[PDB]
Design a protein around this ligand. Sequence first.
Ligand SMILES: COc1ccc(-n2nc3c(c2NC(=O)C2(c4ccc(Cl)cc4)CCCC2)CS(=O)(=O)C3)cc1
Length: 476
Amino acid sequence: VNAVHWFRKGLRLHDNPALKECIQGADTIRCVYILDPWFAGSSNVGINRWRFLLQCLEDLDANLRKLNSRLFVIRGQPADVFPRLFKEWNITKLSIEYDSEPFGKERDAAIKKLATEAGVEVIVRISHTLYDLDKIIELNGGQPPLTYKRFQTLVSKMEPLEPADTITSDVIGKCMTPLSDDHDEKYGVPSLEELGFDTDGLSSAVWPGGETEALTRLERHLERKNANSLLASPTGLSPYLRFGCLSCRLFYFKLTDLYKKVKPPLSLYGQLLWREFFYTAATNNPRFDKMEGNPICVQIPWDKNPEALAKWAEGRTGFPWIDAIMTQLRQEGWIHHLARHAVACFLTRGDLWISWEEGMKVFEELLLDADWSINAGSWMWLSCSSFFQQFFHCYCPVGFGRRTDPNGDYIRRYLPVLRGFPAKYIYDPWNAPEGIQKVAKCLIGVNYPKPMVNHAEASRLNIERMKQIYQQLSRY
Ligand SMILES: COc1ccc(-n2nc3c(c2NC(=O)C2(c4ccc(Cl)cc4)CCCC2)CS(=O)(=O)C3)cc1
């Protein structure tokens, strides 16, 4: 009985039902991760996401060493590699954490067919989400809830959540891992260079990957529970929830019991419920990330403007607040939710009137904490393309951050070319007189671009555009 556990999400040894069940009754246990380096550059996956993943894999491998096992990293496509491994290792069991996202579901269905057609038993267990999303969808009558309010109703009628024991020496028991001395050069965790990324200009990651870092942060986050809010927090947990280094169910229980000790609203579960809601909404919708052909998405005639899109993506808008946020995102992989509101409003309903699909693709590349379902759901939501509950405040790309940080310390940290400007002009340097730009050694339009748009005029038009869209929807 040779059992293999396939890692994709759920990159942890705690609360891993699929791994626990696969281990039980197995003589052999082997943990695999599959990636192809040749397609790493063309997959819209940025270097920070790759680095966080590789660090997750190093931590899994290290933690597996403590249990006397090892992680197997295989280069290739899962449809091509799994037949060879079934025969090479005489696989009897294959286990995966369930993936609700449509393209992952189709991929897993193909792998399940090949495993079964080869006489391999397929173990699937839910642990990336709090609930069985198909059970939520059934309780809603076969269609996913279209509103956060309806979703909360169904969750409130759900039975209280049960977690799962951590994989230990006592859990593994008499289960072995076949290991060779050539293992590291054959199945070792890849470097970024192997994936084709230049690392010479890199600095240490602000968000270190892995289950160890996630559980260390969780204890400090529970202990603890402006301009400094914008900076990454050493107790932030959102990337670890996305990659599965931290179980959302464990996080839920720890939050509940700390709250019980401190004092049971959904104020503290709000982020997890939004996460759960977008997974539920996307799971049966293969065009969830599209406007055309997406049955839940308002059809809005967005501008097609690649040059403006590229200015926003590359932090070259000429609005330092917007550019500092997009620069933090590209450099670190995480920005504050209020900063996401700011740059996403600017791109779509606010200033540039560019499709939410284009912002989603940029965020997909650079953002560490948003799966496909959450990214698409969040972009449709903020652009009033789906899940509509109200019109939104139009954020000011100059004033909003100025009230956040009057001195512009956030601007100065991520846009060093502007550090010479005084606070009076740091958020609108195109208003600085010529002599002031010279002193700051930053000529607007040479060292830093001019503003790409007039916010007052653009936002005024776009606020009205959105109203007309929704007046049409009332008539239909
Ligand atoms: C703009 O692109 C993005 C903005 C946010 C995300 N994102 N990432 C995670 C989560 C979310 N989304 C949210 O929480 C909400 C949201 C939406 C839009 C904005 Cl602007 C801000 C918040 C959904 C409705 C209210 C809260 C929750 S999570 O753990 O599941 C990690 C992704 C892409």
